[PDB]
Amino acid sequence: MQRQFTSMLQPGVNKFSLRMFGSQKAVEKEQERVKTAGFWIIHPYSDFRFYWDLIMLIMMVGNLVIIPVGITFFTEQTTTPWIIFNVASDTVFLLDLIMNFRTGTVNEDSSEIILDPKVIKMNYLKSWFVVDFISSIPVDYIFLIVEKGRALRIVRFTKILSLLRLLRLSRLIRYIHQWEEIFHMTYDLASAVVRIFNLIGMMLLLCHWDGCLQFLVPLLQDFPPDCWVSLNEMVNDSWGKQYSYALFKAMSHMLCIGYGAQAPVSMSDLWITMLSMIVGATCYAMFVGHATALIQSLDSSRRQYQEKYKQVEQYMSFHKLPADMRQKIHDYYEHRYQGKIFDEENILNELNDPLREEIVNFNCRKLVATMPLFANADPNFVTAMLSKLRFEVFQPGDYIIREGAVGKKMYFIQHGVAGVITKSSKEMKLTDGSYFGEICLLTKGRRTASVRADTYCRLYSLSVDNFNEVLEEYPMMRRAFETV
């Protein structure tokens, strides 16, 4: 018993707490910080608080559905099954209320959770305690036992007191918002998907309560001869037929499809219909808003590529380039980026050295390992040099190197067919894994032959400036290269 009884009320070492406090030593400091603070204090991130709030979510989603129906469509709440259900729930929500004095609290300051018991009690008794209190105690039964020391008046007034329980929706909202921030910090939740499912739960709950209110107001007026229950001649129907019609009216007002069987006739039905129409029209506008925010997040990568490309069309149309030249540019962007939008330089700068090294070795080691230098050189040298290679793409017919031009760069074939075209011989084809232009290294001069693309070529290259920038840090390899 005791070894778990103290262990449950303080932060366990887990994927949330290690990512939140930063290390097991920071978690174990926070465990010590509550274990010194007082008797039975509960940390906000504790497993006890998780499983307790999980019981509250089940308990509240039960109560906020059952209570409106029990008050509205049944004769009395004084029978044994209703006395049992209400005393069970009220004692549970009163245990939750006293635990909100022993539990700590978080803040936007991101500082360590406030865990002094007097600091918790003084903050709670100001912030939320009054709405938690009047909805925890059985205000209707404690009024009734006082009224026991006409009957058609006291029962009605009692039904109005019984609905003070619906303020438990504040706890449902609070406890949902607390655990969704904890799931964001652990399970990579999409914000728009979380947000729309919160609104869907509220729309169903408001539509259910409205579907009670539309019958409750006639009942509190003793079913006047001009209201919808009397006009539809269903005052004596079953509780399920009445609930189905009252929910159908509420949902019809919420979606603006119609009023029910006819438009309102009495003052009560006019003003309850208009309240329902406004709560509906606002929920549906907020739902169309959330559906739009969701849909605009889903294809964000496609969208950003379309916006990026359209600025190339603005550039080409400002410069008034001819349509065949625009087709080369359009075709180049499709081969180089393949509809994927990213920034290679920005992404590699925020990685660490081990991840940059691992991604570069995966991309380029199979291409470089065929070369006679890199087959013999040190691993701590080639892994440094591969980080300097720049990716390039060439279209068919383009010259990659021209004879007689100064050779500032040398290249490696990743994909496609190239052709060396010196006048001294028949043309030699080059293919994936081969390399060319190497005679630019550690020398100077014009290129001895031209090279051109016979198909879409995907290449890697490095400049003699970047090659020298590497070799300046590896003078032993510089001496080995200078020999041949």
Residues 220-249 that bind a copy of itself (CB under 8 A): 240-241, 244-245, 247-248
* Euclidean distance between CA atoms 453 and 23, whole angstroms: 54
Of 14, 58, 315, 445, which one interacts with a copy of itself (CB under 8 A)?
315
Q: How far is the CB of 273 from ligand PCW (least distance, A)?
A: 14
How many Cα atoms sit within 13 Å of 245 on the Cβ side?
18
Show contacts with a copy of itself in window 289-308 (CB under 8 A): 289-297, 299-304, 306-307
Tokens standing for residue 194: 């979380």
List the single partner that 283 binds among ligand PCW, a copy of itself, none, CB under 5 to 8 Å by kind. ligand PCW
Q: In Å, how far are 57, 168, 348 from 128, measured between CA atoms?
A: 18, 11, 48
- Is residue 362 involved in binding a copy of itself (CB under 8 A)? yes
Please choose, out of 115-123, 137-145, 392-400, 436-444, the segment that lies near a copy of itself by the rule CB under 8 A: 392-400
The SS3 call for residue 71 is: helix
- Is residue 455 involved in binding a copy of itself (CB under 8 A)? yes
Please choose, out of 250-258, 275-283, 389-397, 467-475, the segment that lies near ligand PCW by the rule CB under 6 A: 275-283
* Euclidean distance between CA atoms 481 and 222, whole angstroms: 102
Q: Was 448 annotated as part of a binding site?
A: yes
Residue 380: its H or E element: helix 379-385
- Asked if residues 213 and 272 have their Cβ atoms less than 8 Å apart, the reply is yes
- How many other C-beta atoms lie within 10 A of the C-beta of residue 370? 12
- Is residue 65 involved in binding a copy of itself (CB under 8 A)? no
Of 54, 274, 439, 442, which one interacts with a copy of itself (CB under 8 A)?
274
Strand partners, 5: none
- Is residue 187 involved in binding a copy of itself (CB under 8 A)? no
Q: Residue 258 is which amino acid?
A: G
Q: Was 433 annotated as part of a binding site?
A: no
DSSP character for 435?
Answer: E
Show contacts with ligand PCW in window 44-73 (CB under 6 A): 61, 65
Q: Which residues of 31-60 are buried (b: 16+ CB within 10 A; e: fewer)?
A: bebbeebeeebbbbbbbbbbebbeebeebb
Q: In Å, how far are 127, 349, 466 from 4, measured between CA atoms?
A: 32, 46, 61
Q: How far is the CB of 106 from a copy of itself (least distance, A)?
A: 12
Q: In Å, how far are 9, 69, 320 from 314, measured between CA atoms?
A: 61, 62, 10
List the single partner that 267 binds among a copy of itself, ligand PCW, none, CB under 5 to 8 Å by kind. a copy of itself
Q: Was 437 annotated as part of a binding site?
A: yes
Show contacts with ligand PCW in window 73-132 (CB under 6 A): none
Of 22, 38, 62, 201, which one interacts with ligand PCW (CB under 6 A)?
201
DSSP character for 473?
Answer: T
List the single partner that 172 binds among a copy of itself, ligand PCW, none, CB under 5 to 8 Å by kind. ligand PCW
- Is residue 198 involved in binding ligand PCW (CB under 6 A)? yes
Q: How far is the CB of 343 from ligand PCW (least distance, A)?
A: 31
* Ranges assigned E (strand) in 156-237: none
Using Cβ positions, the residue closest to ligand PCW within the complex turns out to be 201
List the single partner that 349 binds among a copy of itself, ligand PCW, none, CB under 5 to 8 Å by kind. none
Write the residues followed by a gap in the chain (C–N more than 2.5 A). Answer: 149
Tokens standing for residue 242: 């009445």
- Is residue 185 involved in binding a copy of itself (CB under 8 A)? yes
Q: How far is the CB of 15 from a copy of itself (least distance, A)?
A: 10
DSSP character for 414?
Answer: E
How many Cα atoms sit within 13 Å of 286 on the Cβ side?
16
Q: Which residues are annotated as a binding site?
A: 437-438, 440, 447-448
Footprint on this chain of ligand PCW (rule: CB under 6 A): 61, 65, 172-173, 176, 198-199, 201-202, 204-205, 208, 278-279, 282-283, 286
Q: Which residues are annotated as a binding site for 3',5'-cyclic AMP?
A: 437-438, 440, 447-448
